[model samples]
Target: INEAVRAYIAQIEGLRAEIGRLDATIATLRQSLATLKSLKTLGEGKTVLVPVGSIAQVEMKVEKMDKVVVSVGQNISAELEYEEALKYIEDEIKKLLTFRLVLEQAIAELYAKIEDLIAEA
Candidate 1:
């Protein structure tokens, strides 16, 4: 009987992990949209420090950017207009939110079941 309790707890933890992963992706997506918005008014040919890796930056010359290159997974990417890219990110964030909601409900239900089990004992 206690084994069941342990498994239930494990399931809840797994769901929370999934939610956190989604939260991270959603946050990054929002930040990407912010950068895209900023690019709309940014001047071209300005030298800026571009991130080269986890902890370093390289100076690069920038140019007028009206088109954005977005990753499409499986080693493929596509160039999109600024507005289209913003909409793409917005739509993805909404989709991830729906998935996150389901995970939350599953976690809540798992806790409820555990409570009921404990009460019977």
Candidate 2:
């Protein structure tokens, strides 16, 4: 029961974190668009700008998934810091996602086993 409850909690946390990330992404995109619009008003046509964190950073920490979305803005410019952060984020995503996938498969198998036991009984 403890393991199951903890896993369930993890799932809940994961979903909540995902929602928060999505919201952050939306805000980031909106701000970038606004920046673009402002630039356009200055008679700049079709500018490609990469905006960094304009708004306050939102804390989106989850125990289940430590992997974070690649901060595309961090890689906006071709600088050393950009490359390093981008690489770190990329590797972290790969590691976290692969482990999470394994966890999901195990969870699915466990459920299937429970179903089989119920059917057999």
Candidate 3:
């Protein structure tokens, strides 16, 4: 195989790996959003244990459980209700889905180019 073909193959492989990572990330994000949605059902003033890293769980009272603090950007946070947070997560997922589609199409085009080069040889 020519050097050009080899380079194309390598690039395609790298893109495939990136897509795999993106898929895993998207799945984890979706699962987290689902878990957060379930938290809305918990009653106020309920006691819950907050995980402090892997060390120990700190017991705390759930006050205003309906409100969630979301990091907007640049170390700033905004208080949003559960429903609004869900919307933000959903929007993020949509953006990832769009990026995945673009990567897939680019990979396909590279494969088609490689096939053409092989046929010429």
Candidate 4:
């Protein structure tokens, strides 16, 4: 058993888990982005479907959309205006995607190392 291969296996697992986390977070951010965009389009003075529970969606009036509620991470939430929150989400998505690429690159590199080791044995 090659020690190099053993190290590569663990590194690959770590990267895979990190990628999974990034994927989940990215999905959440994308969902928020969509909701924010729609809300901007919605504006004020409209009847919106507010989900009461799993039971039913109640119709509610939209009087004001002055501020949006967002989680800035680490167990903290912020009240940001529509424009500010939209920009925040967009930038966060871009940063996460770039980091995702870095993680993917290392996973492939580790796989390549193990394959080369296998060929020698």
Q: Choose 2 or 4, whichever is better by lDDT.
A: 4
lDDT of 4 by residue, 33-63 (tens): 7876777788678888888879799998876
lDDT of 2 at 21: 69
lDDT score, candidate 3, position 116: 86
lDDT of 3 by residue, 1-121 (tens): 6888889889989998998999898899888787776666777788888889897889877667657888876697888986887798788889988998998899888889988887885
Question: What's the distance in Å from true for residue 33, model 3?
Answer: 0.8
lDDT of 1 by residue, 79-102 (tens): 878787778779878989998988
Off by over 4 Å in 3: none
Residue 100's lDDT in candidate 2: 59
Q: Give the Cα RMSD of candidate 1.
A: 1.9
lDDT of 1: 0.83
The candidate maximizing TM-score is 1
Measured against the true structure, the TM-scores of the candidates, in listed sequence, are 0.85, 0.36, 0.83, 0.69
Better of 1 and 3 by TM-score: 1
Give stretches of model 1 more than 4 Å off. 115-121
Judge candidate 3 at residue 6 and give its lDDT: 84
lDDT of 3 at 25: 89
- Report lDDT (Cα) of residue 42, candidate 1: 71
**TM-score, candidate number 3:** 0.83
